[PDB]
Amino acid sequence: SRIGRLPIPVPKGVSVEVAPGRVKVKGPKGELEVPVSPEMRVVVEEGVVRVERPSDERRHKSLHGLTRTLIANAVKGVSEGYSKELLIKGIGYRARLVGRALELTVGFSHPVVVEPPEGITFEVPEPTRVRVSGIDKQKVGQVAANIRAIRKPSAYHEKGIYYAGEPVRLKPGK
Amino acid sequence: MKGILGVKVGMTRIFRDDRAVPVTVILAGPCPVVQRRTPEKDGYTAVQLGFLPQNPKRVNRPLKGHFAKAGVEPVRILREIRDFNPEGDTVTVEIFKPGERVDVTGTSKGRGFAGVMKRWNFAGGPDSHGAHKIHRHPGSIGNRKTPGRVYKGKKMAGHYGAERVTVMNLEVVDVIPEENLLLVKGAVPGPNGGLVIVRETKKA
Amino acid sequence: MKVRASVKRICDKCKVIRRHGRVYVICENPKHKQRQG
Amino acid sequence: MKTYVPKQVEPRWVLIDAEGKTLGRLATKIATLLRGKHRPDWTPNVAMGDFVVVVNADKIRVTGKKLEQKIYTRYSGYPGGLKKIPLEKMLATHPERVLEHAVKGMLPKGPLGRRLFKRLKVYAGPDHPHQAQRPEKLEV
Amino acid sequence: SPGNCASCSNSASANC
RNA sequence: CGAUGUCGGCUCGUCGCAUCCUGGGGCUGAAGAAGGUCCCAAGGGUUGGGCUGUUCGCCCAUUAAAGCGGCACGCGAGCUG
RNA sequence: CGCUGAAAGCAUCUAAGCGGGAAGCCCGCCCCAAGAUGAGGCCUCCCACGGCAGCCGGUAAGGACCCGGGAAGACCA
Ligand SMILES: [Mg+2]
Ligand SMILES: [Mg+2]
Ligand SMILES: [Mg+2]
Ligand SMILES: [Mg+2]
Ligand SMILES: [Mg+2]
Ligand SMILES: [Mg+2]
Ligand SMILES: [Mg+2]
Ligand SMILES: [Mg+2]
Ligand SMILES: [Mg+2]
Ligand SMILES: [Mg+2]
Ligand SMILES: [Mg+2]
Ligand SMILES: [Mg+2]
Ligand SMILES: [Mg+2]
Ligand SMILES: [Mg+2]
Ligand SMILES: [Mg+2]
Ligand SMILES: [Mg+2]
Ligand SMILES: [Mg+2]
Ligand SMILES: [Mg+2]
Ligand SMILES: [Mg+2]
Ligand SMILES: [Mg+2]
Ligand SMILES: [Mg+2]
Ligand SMILES: [Mg+2]
Ligand SMILES: [Mg+2]
Ligand SMILES: [Mg+2]
Ligand SMILES: [Mg+2]
Ligand SMILES: [Mg+2]
Ligand SMILES: [Mg+2]
Ligand SMILES: [Mg+2]
Ligand SMILES: [Mg+2]
Ligand SMILES: [Mg+2]
Ligand SMILES: [Mg+2]
Ligand SMILES: [Mg+2]
Ligand SMILES: [Mg+2]
Ligand SMILES: [Mg+2]
Ligand SMILES: [Mg+2]
Ligand SMILES: [Mg+2]
Ligand SMILES: [Mg+2]
Ligand SMILES: [Mg+2]
Ligand SMILES: [Mg+2]
Ligand SMILES: [Mg+2]
Ligand SMILES: [Mg+2]
Ligand SMILES: [Mg+2]
Ligand SMILES: [Mg+2]
Ligand SMILES: [Mg+2]
Ligand SMILES: [Mg+2]
Ligand SMILES: [Mg+2]
Ligand SMILES: [Mg+2]
Ligand SMILES: [Mg+2]
Ligand SMILES: [Mg+2]
Ligand SMILES: [Mg+2]
Ligand SMILES: [Mg+2]
Ligand SMILES: [Mg+2]
Ligand SMILES: [Mg+2]
Ligand SMILES: [Mg+2]
Ligand SMILES: [Mg+2]
Ligand SMILES: [Mg+2]
Ligand SMILES: [Mg+2]
Ligand SMILES: [Mg+2]
Ligand SMILES: [Mg+2]
Ligand SMILES: [Mg+2]
Numbered sequence: 041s042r043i044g045r046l047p048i049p050v051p052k053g054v055s056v057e058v059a060p061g062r063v064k065v066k067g068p069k070g071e072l073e074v075p076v077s078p079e080m081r082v083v084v085e086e087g088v089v090r091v092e093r094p095s096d097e098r099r100h101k102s103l104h105g106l107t108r109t110l111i112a113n114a115v116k117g118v119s120e121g122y123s124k125e126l127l128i129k130g131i132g133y134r135a136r137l138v139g140r141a142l143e144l145t146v147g148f149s150h151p152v153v154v155e156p157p158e159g160i161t162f163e164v165p166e167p168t169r170v171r172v173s174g175i176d177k178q179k180v181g182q183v184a185a186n187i188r189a190i191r192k193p194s195a196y197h198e199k200g201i202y203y204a205g206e207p208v209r210l211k212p213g214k
Numbered sequence: 215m216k217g218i219l220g221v222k223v224g225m226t227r228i229f230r231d232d233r234a235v236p237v238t239v240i241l242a243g244p245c246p247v248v249q250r251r252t253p254e255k256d257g258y259t260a261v262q263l264g265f266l267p268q269n270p271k272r273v274n275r276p277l278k279g280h281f282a283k284a285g286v287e288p289v290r291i292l293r294e295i296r297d298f299n300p301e302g303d304t305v306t307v308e309i310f311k312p313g314e315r316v317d318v319t320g321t322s323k324g325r326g327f328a329g330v331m332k333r334w335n336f337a338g339g340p341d342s343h344g345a346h347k348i349h350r351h352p353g354s355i356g357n358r359k360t361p362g363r364v365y366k367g368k369k370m371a372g373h374y375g376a377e378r379v380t381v382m383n384l385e386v387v388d389v390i391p392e393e394n395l396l397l398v399k400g401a402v403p404g405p406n407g408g409l410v411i412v413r414e415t416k417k418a
Numbered sequence: 419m420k421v422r423a424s425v426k427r428i429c430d431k432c433k434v435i436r437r438h439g440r441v442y443v444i445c446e447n448p449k450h451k452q453r454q455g
Numbered sequence: 456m457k458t459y460v461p462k463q464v465e466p467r468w469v470l471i472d473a474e475g476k477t478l479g480r481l482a483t484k485i486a487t488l489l490r491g492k493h494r495p496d497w498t499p500n501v502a503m504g505d506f507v508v509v510v511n512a513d514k515i516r517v518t519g520k521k522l523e524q525k526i527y528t529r530y531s532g533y534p535g536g537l538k539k540i541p542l543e544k545m546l547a548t549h550p551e552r553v554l555e556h557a558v559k560g561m562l563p564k565g566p567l568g569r570r571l572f573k574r575l576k577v578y579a580g581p582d583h584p585h586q587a588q589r590p591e592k593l594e595v
Numbered sequence: 596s597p598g599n600c601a602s603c604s605n606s607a608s609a610n611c
Numbered sequence: 612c613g614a615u616g617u618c619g620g621c622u623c624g625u626c627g628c629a630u631c632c633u634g635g636g637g638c639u640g641a642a643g644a645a646g647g648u649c650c651c652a653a654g655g656g657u658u659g660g661g662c663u664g665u666u667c668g669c670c671c672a673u674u675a676a677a678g679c680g681g682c683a684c685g686c687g688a689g690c691u692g
Numbered sequence: 693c694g695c696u697g698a699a700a701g702c703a704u705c706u707a708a709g710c711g712g713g714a715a716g717c718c719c720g721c722c723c724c725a726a727g728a729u730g731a732g733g734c735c736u737c738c739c740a741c742g743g744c745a746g747c748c749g750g751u752a753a754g755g756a757c758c759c760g761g762g763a764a765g766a767c768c769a
């Protein structure tokens with residue numbers, strides 16, 4: 041029934057150093073800084089990072105759970121890494137990689153060419169399935185969201201860009 | 215941002231691809247540079263251009279020393295082109311080639327004291343049906359006790375024209391370097407003989 | 419989006435939240451989306 | 456006896472670092488310096504306050520949501536000519552006006568008050584050109 | 596007109 | 612009440628926004644197209660004519676649209692009457 | 693409309709933080725503008741005149757007056 045007090049397992053060898061209002065997480069896949077409220081305290085133990093709040097007032101309880109997850113996400117980010125998948129659906133709809141870029145054919149009068157931000161890598165296996173990959177979890181989700189917005193699921197037809205595991209809830213037409 | 219000083223000479227029309235293109239003809243160069251405005255010295259970037267030779271017997275000592283430091287013959291007009299730094303020390307019509315687009319700044323023709331119908335295209339009054347001495351009059355100029363005054367900027371009679379006008383995005387139809395001539399499609403502010411400034415367009 | 423002075427839950431899936439000084443009712447049924455105003 | 460009136464004094468020059476100080480609470484003291492009410496010979500109808508140089512005016516501080524919500528206002532006289540500039544943008548364009556506007560509204564209106572405003576010299580950034588006057592650094 | 600005789604102010608010339 | 616000229620039209624604007632159009636939206640009993648309803652938005656735009664003193668209204672032909680109100684039922688030391 | 697995300701093990705556009713997004717807002721374009729008395733800046737010219745922050749005079753660089761005019765203009769400019 042609590043997230044802030046949940047100890048953070050740390051794989052080996054990802055290192056986590058604490059600094060005023062920022063923790064620095066270094067791992068195999070890269071590095072990430074996590075800006076932390078000075079009101080919390082981040083504690084490093086044997087292969088385990090922990091966070092403590094100074095009181096039980098709501099701003100401290102609210103910051104507490106947040107701060108633990110932000111650090112846990114960076115630790116998973118530099119070791120496992122993060123990724124999201126997108127499923128293209130629709131008859132003429134497909135995707136292909138061009139250099140490091142992502143080119144979308146989703147029913148417009150033109151292709152749509154998405155360029156990967158620094159720290160993000162695009163891969164197209166099947167021409168109908170895209171995977172967004174990176175070490176920053178928010179950044180991975182942001183890019184994935186950006187791509188999906190180019191052609192959202194239709195309300196009436198199984199056409200458009202879909203999240204992997206996104207239900208197909210359609211409504212009748214005539 | 216290229217620019218050059220010039221004099222409006224007059225209008226005609228030429229024929230280009232079985233079309234008649236109205237042109238106004240501008241005698242642009244040559245424009246010697248007499249001073250450069252640097253960010254270190256002046257806070258901005260510009261060239262002071264000279265234009266049209268002047269009888270040295272007419273040029274006072276303060277001006278004559280300005281020309282001296284430039285190594286330039288006395289000239290009748292000095293105007294700056296902002297954000298223009300030409301490689302040479304002389305600017306000529308050949309900074310424009312046909313097809314480019316320009317903005318031309320002149321002093322419009324001066325109508326003196328212009329009534330409200332010429333200056334602001336007001337509708338005047340009726341010319342019959344009882345209209346009493348108000349045929350060219352502007353009508354109401356306000357409300358009543360609220361606000362009991364007349365807006366700043368109210369359109370009223372007064373001097374009109376003889377003011378700076380820039381007309382923009384004019385196609386350069388031709389340039390005749392042999393004669394410092396510059397043909398431009400359309401109309402340009404001011405009278406024949408007026409001084410004009412020709413600048414690369416700011417439209418895209 | 420319904421916009422009204424009385425924002426209430428309509429079904430058991432409706433959720434009352436507070437975004438940027440305003441009260442919303444978000445829900446999986448798009449008709450149940452409400453903003454107070 | 457009659458109340459002592461001073462002969463013309465030599466004004467003091469004074470330096471203040473505005474960094475991190477609250478806008479209104481700093482302006483209150485600068486106003487007091489400007490009026491000279493910190494002097495035991497304060498006369499209400501002449502200028503005898505100090506000259507006040509202020510640095511780092513761009514790093515003045517404010518509470519609440521005032522960066523977004525404090526609106527400076529100017530009226531041109533023309534129809535529809537009420538302009539509105541929030542604190543944020545005023546700070547990002549003419550940061551010295553934020554302090555100047557606050558001190559200005561805390562000075563007396565009239566000729567003397569206008570002169571006293573001229574004895575304020577507000578600068579953004581850590582430096583000022585009045586080295587010649589050798590201002591005494593004040594703590595407020 | 597005020598003038599003539601139904602009204603009586605603001606509106607016509609001398610007569611009195 | 613030792614006078615604060617009274618409808619409408621014309622002229623000239625200017626403001627409000629409870630928005631007629633144009634721009635941005637959510638919901639739709641939204642297939643598409645076209646609507647409905649609500650939200651944001653006052654930058655600009657908001658036609659010509661027949662009838663009547665008319666304001667309004669009806670009608671004709673169009674329109675992206677033919678918005679509603681305030682300014683002494685805006686404005687007669689500006690006109691009309 | 694989102695991303696990430698607690699309080700509240702889930703969920704949440706938000707409480708920390710980050711995106712997208714209007715003919716509207718700020719710039720950008722055109723014109724006025726240092727009486728902006730906070731009277732700005734740059735280039736050039738004259739200069740240490742003779743008499744008891746002041747006075748009277750002769751000048752310097754310059755300017756005005758007068759005149760011939762002007763697609764400038766009521767006069768003025
Ligand atoms: Mg001719
Ligand atoms: Mg040709
Ligand atoms: Mg033709
Ligand atoms: Mg000339
Ligand atoms: Mg001209
Ligand atoms: Mg000119
Ligand atoms: Mg002229
Ligand atoms: Mg003309
Ligand atoms: Mg007229
Ligand atoms: Mg006309
Ligand atoms: Mg005209
Ligand atoms: Mg006109
Ligand atoms: Mg005009
Ligand atoms: Mg008319
Ligand atoms: Mg008419
Ligand atoms: Mg007429
Ligand atoms: Mg007539
Ligand atoms: Mg009559
Ligand atoms: Mg009359
Ligand atoms: Mg007549
Ligand atoms: Mg009139
Ligand atoms: Mg009145
Ligand atoms: Mg009236
Ligand atoms: Mg008034
Ligand atoms: Mg004039
Ligand atoms: Mg003009
Ligand atoms: Mg064109
Ligand atoms: Mg020639
Ligand atoms: Mg939900
Ligand atoms: Mg005494
Ligand atoms: Mg203080
Ligand atoms: Mg003090
Ligand atoms: Mg004082
Ligand atoms: Mg005093
Ligand atoms: Mg604030
Ligand atoms: Mg008072
Ligand atoms: Mg009478
Ligand atoms: Mg009465
Ligand atoms: Mg009387
Ligand atoms: Mg009276
Ligand atoms: Mg009377
Ligand atoms: Mg009276
Ligand atoms: Mg509204
Ligand atoms: Mg409003
Ligand atoms: Mg309504
Ligand atoms: Mg609309
Ligand atoms: Mg729309
Ligand atoms: Mg809609
Ligand atoms: Mg149904
Ligand atoms: Mg249908
Ligand atoms: Mg549709
Ligand atoms: Mg709504
Ligand atoms: Mg509007
Ligand atoms: Mg308005
Ligand atoms: Mg309107
Ligand atoms: Mg009509
Ligand atoms: Mg008829
Ligand atoms: Mg009619
Ligand atoms: Mg009618
Ligand atoms: Mg009426």
Ligand SMILES: [Mg+2]
Binds near residue numbers: 667668
């Ligand atoms: Mg009727």
Ligand SMILES: [Mg+2]
Binds near residue numbers: 669
């Ligand atoms: Mg009827």
Ligand SMILES: [Mg+2]
Binds near residue numbers: 675
């Ligand atoms: Mg339409």
Ligand SMILES: [Mg+2]
């Ligand atoms: Mg219609």
Ligand SMILES: [Mg+2]
Binds near residue numbers: 680
């Ligand atoms: Mg109305």
Ligand SMILES: [Mg+2]
Binds near residue numbers: 681
């Ligand atoms: Mg009223």
Ligand SMILES: [Mg+2]
């Ligand atoms: Mg109106």
Ligand SMILES: [Mg+2]
Binds near residue numbers: 684
């Ligand atoms: Mg009424």
Ligand SMILES: [Mg+2]
Binds near residue numbers: 684
């Ligand atoms: Mg009535």
Ligand SMILES: [Mg+2]
Binds near residue numbers: 684
């Ligand atoms: Mg009335």
Ligand SMILES: [Mg+2]
């Ligand atoms: Mg009206």
Ligand SMILES: [Mg+2]
Binds near residue numbers: 606687
């Ligand atoms: Mg009358």
Ligand SMILES: [Mg+2]
Binds near residue numbers: 687
């Ligand atoms: Mg009337």
Ligand SMILES: [Mg+2]
């Ligand atoms: Mg009236």
Ligand SMILES: [Mg+2]
């Ligand atoms: Mg009146």
Ligand SMILES: [Mg+2]
Binds near residue numbers: 688
């Ligand atoms: Mg009257």
